[PDB]
Amino acid sequence: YPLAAWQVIAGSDIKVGDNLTTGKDGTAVPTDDPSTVFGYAVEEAQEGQLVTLVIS
Amino acid sequence: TQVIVSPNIAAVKQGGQQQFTAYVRATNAKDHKVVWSVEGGSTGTAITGD
Amino acid sequence: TFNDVKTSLGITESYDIVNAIRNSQGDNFKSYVPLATANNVAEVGAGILINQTVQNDFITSLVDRIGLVVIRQVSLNNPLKKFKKGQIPLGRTIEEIYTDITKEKQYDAEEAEQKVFEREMPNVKTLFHERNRQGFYHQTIQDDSLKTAFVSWGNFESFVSSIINAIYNSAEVDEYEYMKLLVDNYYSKGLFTTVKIDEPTSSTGALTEFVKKMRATARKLTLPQGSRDWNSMAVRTRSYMEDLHLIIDADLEAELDVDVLAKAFNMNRTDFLGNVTVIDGFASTGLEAVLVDKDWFMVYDNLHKMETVRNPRGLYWNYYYHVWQTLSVSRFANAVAFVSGDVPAVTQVIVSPNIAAVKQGGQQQFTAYVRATNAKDHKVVWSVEGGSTGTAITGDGLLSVSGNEDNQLTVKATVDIGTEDKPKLVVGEAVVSIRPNNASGGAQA
Amino acid sequence: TFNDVKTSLGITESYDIVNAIRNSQGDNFKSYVPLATANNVAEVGAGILINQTVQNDFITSLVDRIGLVVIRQVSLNNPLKKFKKGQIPLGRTIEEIYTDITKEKQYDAEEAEQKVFEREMPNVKTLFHERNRQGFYHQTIQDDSLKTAFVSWGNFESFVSSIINAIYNSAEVDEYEYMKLLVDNYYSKGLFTTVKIDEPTSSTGALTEFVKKMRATARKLTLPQGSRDWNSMAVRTRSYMEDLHLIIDADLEAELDVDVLAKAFNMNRTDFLGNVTVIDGFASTGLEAVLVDKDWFMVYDNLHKMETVRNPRGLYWNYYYHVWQTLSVSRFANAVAFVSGDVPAVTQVIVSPNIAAVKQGGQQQFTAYVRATNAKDHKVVWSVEGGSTGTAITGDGLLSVSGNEDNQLTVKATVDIGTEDKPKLVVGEAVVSIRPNNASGGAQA
């Protein structure tokens, strides 16, 4: 069901607009190297909290 | 004096919604902010303003 | 379907009565020391929001039961319902028509040779009302799933008879609240004829001033020759003492009878002269004690329908109770506001005829009624918005429409309040449509 | 619309009846040779599932016609409808309270010096039957599409009543299938007292052995001192003979008539005791017959409504027939299963008081009954599960409780069946509430 945005457990602290990639245990962590980027967060989240961001 | 959440007993199906609201007894007649916070839950369950 | 929910659930204790308050004390709470079972009275004596099932003390396999089931039945009503007017089935708009008095002419037999058939029109002012409210109330009853909540059909039917009244109580609450909104709407638009008072909470002497201005204004309204203030349309209207309704909250009703009426020896001399309806209170700032005619309200009803439907495979009724009604207030009946606090010096400029029509080349006379809340003078500056090259008011409100022109003039009447650094302007407007004049012909000489 | 479907659709032909008449002479098909039209009766003589249009024999242009429409209206019933206890319109839960017998004490005569007012609670066990089936049925009657299928209103109306009966017959059939489910539930849970006996339809003497064990077990149920041996709660209950019901299947009825009741000079000394109903057969493997009281079944009705709705847009009637009922089984009544295959040695461990409420620091005696077939000398291994240290139970069942427990306990009685390599553990369980005490000695010595 093609989702435009997901809710993924943050593997660290994530700021709004941060590009995200996979982390430990499949968690979402901040990145900076295009290729690892699968989505951009739309809200701030602390480690262990869900963060919702658009795919793209 | 006292804050009153109006749906006191609520029952929500898993993956559902519920609209809570709060009455605030205050003698001072000052505007007061109501800070909505859900507890006892897991990763996923969240509440907004109102 | 619940867990181990605590009793002190939605309770922030201003002090714990259970602990050292009743235990460690040499003070007020010494009379609760001789109580033995007082901890459990302190625990669930306020009531329990959720019933956890309790086993019997002696035989733990049995279950303690519900002994008494009380169904509290409430009946709400509308105090302002006595000001309603009826039912309007068809149409939407209400045309209100007031014919005002005219001006005398001098007798002359010689000018009457040629001024037979002369025309003098009436002074009619119209006002227009419209349906505002149309909302509905929705209450679902699942009949069959509520029967597990019950023994005793008397309590089952009383509970079902209560849910229908809660649709009926929601009409009384809103219609009181809409008719209270007609007072604050009509005060925010500055249409009340305000009377500045000092605040009656502050002293008993400033209350004694307040009682006089109610008894004085109520005399001024009921004068048989009428009065061209006290309404927003500024026509001359007498009122009747049996029709003046005072809308005063219980805060101000309590300061009256404790100070004024009880210490008075002749209660029918400091009384409020008429009908004191007791409101829960106004919502504006400083607005106290509105004095209105009964014809000031124009509340009509358009429909009152209880439309139902039934879901078969859900086995429930949905009750849709529709209320549609026309909620508006007159500007022909008198309406006096009793305002404490800072008021404008002039709340309202009213311009005689609000609308006018005049041939291009013709002329028209105006009258700026100034609702100044004090014994002060205010010169009116007249103005023509939308005029061009010949259309000009000559001072004192004599519009002289020129000719050539048809673009719907607007006539202002401004009262300036205050300093030049803050020139506060109170503008009353009239609109003028121009009928063309073919008796002239373009050029002349 | 269908293409060339032959009149043989799902037909598995044992032999060609056309060729067995046509070829073979001298055998039993010789009497079908003097039939002139036997090839045509043999073709379409079993009914056809799909109607090919068949042209007329005289004029090929015309078609042959559907002259007769025959509507089978089978009505079904519930053979177990006698077992129902009535109707519960209001409320949800049904409570059965049984006050068991007590244990004898020796006459004390000197230990009674301090035990005059010592109290011993009755052995009151209980059980709570709440509403289980909450269902509805559902039909669409798109009657305007159906008017093409019929040419008379007598066949249009008899067919519409035929779909209504399918709503009611589905209620009849499924109420039977839930009341068989309650037997297979109670057997799968091991609450049936297994009488272990090889199959009646296997040999003649195994048929008679069954009849000897039927009338033995029916006698053991009705003895005027009762027994604990036939409940799942192990209370001394007593059945009556008129209330016993036997639910054998259909083969076991016919074996009684032909093999032992035919040869019976005294049929009352052979046939089954109690009432015998005949059902299609239990789903569970090996379950041959079930002997219950009338009180074993607790089926109450809660709702039987049928509500219709009309879709104006699709032109159809919906017919929702709601059935709400309490489908539960009393564990206090005697019930015996007769089971053919290999069963386990222990089917149930029944634990006494079974809902306890100790004092924190106190002690409760727990006794465990063991259901068995051959019986044995098994063992009972007690335990208790709750997160405290302290709180140990003896090998005799006397549960000790810690002075600081504060968690609900779960007392187990585990019997091992089979080897230590693959152990089968039949576990009977209880619960303990703690009731916190107020010793206030935090550190003793």
DSSP code string of C195-207: EE---TTT-HHHH
Beta-bridged to residue C432, according to DSSP, are C356, C409
Residue C148 CA to residue D324 CA, distance in Å, equals 12
Describe the strand order of the beta sheet including D335-339 as a list of residue ranges.
Answer: D193-196, D335-339, D287-292, D245-246, D275-276
Resolution in A: 3.2
The residue type of A11 is: G
> Contact partners of A by the rule of 3+ C-beta pairs under 8 A?
B
Q: What Å distances lie between residue C331 and B8, B25, C215, CA to CA?
A: 47, 39, 22
The residue type of B36 is: W
Minimal-distance CA residue of chain D relative to C311: D309
Structure tokens at C334: 């008198």
Structure tokens at C399: 């519009």
Place of tokens 């599960």: D385
Closest CA to D336 of D429, D401, D270, D274: D274
Exposed, middle or buried, D233 (CB in 10 Å: 0-12/13-18/19+)?
A: buried
Closest CA to C289 of C382, C201, C395: C201
C49 touches B: beta carbon within 8 Å: yes
Beta-bridged to residue C87, according to DSSP, are C301
Residues in chain A: 56
Nearest chain D CA: its distance from C145 CA (Å): 10
Q: What Å distances lie between residue D159 and D72, D154, D248, D314, CA to CA?
A: 9, 9, 37, 20
Residue D15 CA to residue A17 CA, distance in Å, equals 79
Closest CA to D411 of D348, D364, D359, D361: D364
Residue D102 CA to residue D242 CA, distance in Å, equals 28
* β-pairing verdict for C297-311 and C84-87: parallel
Place of tokens 């004192």: C396
Residue D257 CA to residue D271 CA, distance in Å, equals 9
C36 touches D: beta carbon within 8 Å: no
Structure tokens at A50: 């869900």
Report DSSP letters for C11-28, one per residue: ---SS-TTTHHHHS-SSG
Determine whether the interchain pair B44/A50 forms a contact, defined as Cβ–Cβ distance below 8 Å.
Answer: yes
| Chain C contact probe: residue of B2, B12, B27 with most C CBs at under 10 A | B2
D133 touches C: beta carbon within 8 Å: no
Q: Which of B1, B5, B11 sits opposite C10 (nearest CB)?
A: B5
Determine whether the interchain pair D305/C315 forms a contact, defined as Cβ–Cβ distance below 8 Å.
Answer: yes
Residue D146 CA to residue D342 CA, distance in Å, equals 55
> Contact partners of C by the rule of 3+ C-beta pairs under 8 A?
B, D
Judged by DSSP in three states, D54 sits in: coil
Closest CA to D181 of D41, D50, D328, D67: D328
Residue C375 CA to residue C45 CA, distance in Å, equals 62
CA atoms within 13 A on the CB side of A15: 3
Which residues touch C57 (CB under 8 Å, ≥6 apart)?
Answer: none
Q: Which residues of C touch D94 (CB under 8 A)?
A: none
Q: Is the pair D, A in contact (3+ CB pairs within 8 Å)?
A: no
Which residues touch C97 (CB under 8 Å, ≥6 apart)?
Answer: C124, C125, C126
Exposed, middle or buried, C386 (CB in 10 Å: 0-12/13-18/19+)?
A: middle
Structure tokens at C86: 């009826």
Exposed, middle or buried, C239 (CB in 10 Å: 0-12/13-18/19+)?
A: buried
Number of CB atoms found within 10 A of residue C203's CB: 12
For residue C163, report the phi and psi dihedrals to the nearest 5 degrees: -75, -30
Minimal-distance CA residue of chain B relative to A9: B43
Place of tokens 């068989």: D180
Structure tokens at D262: 């035919």
Residue C196 CA to residue C341 CA, distance in Å, equals 8
B43 touches A: beta carbon within 8 Å: yes
Contact predicate D179/D228, CB 8 Å? no
What sign results for the dihedral spanned by CA atoms C227, C231, C232, C236? negative
Place of tokens 């590009």: A19
Place of tokens 């714990």: C16
Contact predicate C251/C237, CB 8 Å? no
Closest CA to C179 of C80, C46, C75: C80
The residue type of D60 is: T
- The CA angle C254-C260-C266, to the nearest 5 degrees, is 130
For residue C20, report the phi and psi dihedrals to the nearest 5 degrees: -40, -20
Determine whether the interchain pair B8/C10 forms a contact, defined as Cβ–Cβ distance below 8 Å.
Answer: yes
Q: Which residues of C124-134 are buried (b: 16+ CB within 10 A; e: fewer)?
A: ebebebebebe
Residue C125 CA to residue C352 CA, distance in Å, equals 10
Exposed, middle or buried, A53 (CB in 10 Å: 0-12/13-18/19+)?
A: buried
Residue D193 CA to residue D276 CA, distance in Å, equals 19
Interface of A to B at Cβ within 8 Å reads: 7, 9, 48-50
Judged by DSSP in three states, B12 sits in: coil
Judged by DSSP in three states, D155 sits in: helix
Nearest chain B CA: its distance from C130 CA (Å): 34
For residue C295, report the phi and psi dihedrals to the nearest 5 degrees: -85, 0
Determine whether the interchain pair C313/D308 forms a contact, defined as Cβ–Cβ distance below 8 Å.
Answer: no
Report DSSP letters for D288-339, one per residue: EEEEE-SSSEEEEEEEEEEEEEEETTTTEEEEEEEEEEEEEE-TTS-EEEEE
Residue C134 CA to residue C175 CA, distance in Å, equals 12
